[PDB]
Subunit: 185 residues, 4 copies
Amino acid sequence: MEDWKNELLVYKFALDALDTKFSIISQEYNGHNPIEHTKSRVKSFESIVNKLMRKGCKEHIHDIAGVRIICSFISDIYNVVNVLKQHEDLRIVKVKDYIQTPKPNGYRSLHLIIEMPVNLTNRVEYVKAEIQIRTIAMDFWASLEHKIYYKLNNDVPKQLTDELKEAAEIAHYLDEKMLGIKKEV
Amino acid sequence: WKNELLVYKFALDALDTKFSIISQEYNGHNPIEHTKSRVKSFESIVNKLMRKGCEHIHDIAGVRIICSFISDIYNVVNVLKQHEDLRIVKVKDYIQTPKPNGYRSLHLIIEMPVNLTNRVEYVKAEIQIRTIAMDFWASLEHKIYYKLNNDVPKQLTDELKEAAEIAHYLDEKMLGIKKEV
Amino acid sequence: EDWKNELLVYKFALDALDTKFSIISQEYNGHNPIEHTKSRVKSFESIVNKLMRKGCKEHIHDIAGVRIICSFISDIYNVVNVLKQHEDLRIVKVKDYIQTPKPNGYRSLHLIIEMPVNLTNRVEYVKAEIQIRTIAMDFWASLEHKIYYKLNNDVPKQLTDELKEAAEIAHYLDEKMLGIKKEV
Amino acid sequence: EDWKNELLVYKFALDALDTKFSIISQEYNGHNPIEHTKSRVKSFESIVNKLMRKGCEEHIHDIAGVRIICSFISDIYNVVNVLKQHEDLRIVKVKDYIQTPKPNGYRSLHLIIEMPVNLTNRVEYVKAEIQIRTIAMDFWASLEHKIYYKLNNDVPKQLTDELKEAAEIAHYLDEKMLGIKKEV
């Protein structure tokens, strides 16, 4: 419907606001910042419905506004998470530390759903957003697995999924080994 | 002084998305064409503070909203009043009561919360809302006074006042033509 | 089909022209006259309505359009004089609507060029129409379009006459504002 | 004295190269291998410190530097073959540090080019060094430089050896991660 242009637009505003917050977060480290790139994605209404096609057509979907913070090191992930707690204009509703507690896919990230106030002209709206904080190799393994499942439509053999598992054992072992090298300085 | 001016830099970066969003509620036409933010330098602060004793200066962070029509100027003012995350401290409508210079604008100092890591700071910023010709007449006068160092002959100032008297009659006429649509 | 391939070369040329004007202005920072540069690749629908006078042929010049908004009238011709001293573009056509304005009051300085674009395949020579204007010229044009657009070409004489008045003054302004700079 | 003009053309060359890589990726809108492009004009100071092997006061190549960071190893050479089919740049030198890596573990594909820059005065033929890398290559390089900076070129043996171990894996990753795309 066209009640959808108005509400989905509010979610776009929240992302523009988060960009300056994450720009400011690194600008308090300008003495080094771990946030290298940040990719924000508002869901395309239909993907909402196809995911809502599991339920009934509701404002309980968290990844309407999604942001991926890609940090340099694992230690830098939790540093941003702990920093986001000391901010008032957003409260952490949920947090899922898939690092150390990964999925059977090998998938590792640190998701956290927030409640975001958006100052508009009429009044204020409180929208939810799910932030996914990852290292470099974590965002690349995730983007790769998705692009594989996209072409093959969920029908992936065991060896191909097992290969993806090996890449996760390494990418974390990589991010682990690369972390200990920074620790020496 | 390194850290404190940075908070003012964050305040302007935050307003840019606010003005970007205000224009996206008209996507049925938006009046804000360009927006130029200028954080004043350390040296400019002191020389202007040289009239008192060494953060009560408001235009530390300055924003210029250049609107298309005069009517759109007050619409941004009325929009900024229905906002909670900033409160209007002062308002100077140099339109309708302009300076003897011919200078016309609508300045308004606000108090802006800046969410940092430790806590929040409430900083002041001066927003200067203008039409196109107001920003061009202002930018020209400043560049004249800059080259001549405040020593401007009377004839040159009279034309600038004349140039301002006309530019408003322009912005007035161009507004009434839009009204017919 | 092959409309996607040809329209992209026109989009690419603007990306190439965009850096040329960024470089042109970075050679005058000792003051540069270029305040805005807005590139607009023409819309597929607008092309047809303009092509509806011919047959659905690359003789439409403003497929890639750039608006140079300069501070003063004197600043316009300096960009023209700079654009003449470039090899990788040759001026094909020139229409000085300043001093020779239309009856609507429209004033600008258009000049069609031919631009080489080095691509992967080889190089393509496309046409672009550059429109150099002052601040008030770009605003009077943008306003007239928005008026004719809403009223669908049916605009009374009184409304156009006001527009005639509005254009005659803004130039007298741009002239008066020009002469004030001369004294400095 | 007038270092200002000659160093400035290197800034202009990147503005032109930036659109070439922006346009190269727009010819793949059917998949693009170029993820980000970062242009770095060398710092007035670094030129001299780099010149400390010769005599102070244009045979230093990386004055204008561009890093194409690709997703996979196969995507690197696709950019190389695309850059060969362009006329407005000729490859002077090519160093494939992949397959022939350094003893520190550094891996990339460097190639110095010669770029014509159309300016207002005339055209200048400048050199630029493009470094094409995967994701892990740019991160390992950024790590090694940040280490040598803190330790002032004085790095112990284990740290250099660990970095090679860290490098031996990241490429074995980029190799394994490459074949997974091939199965699709």
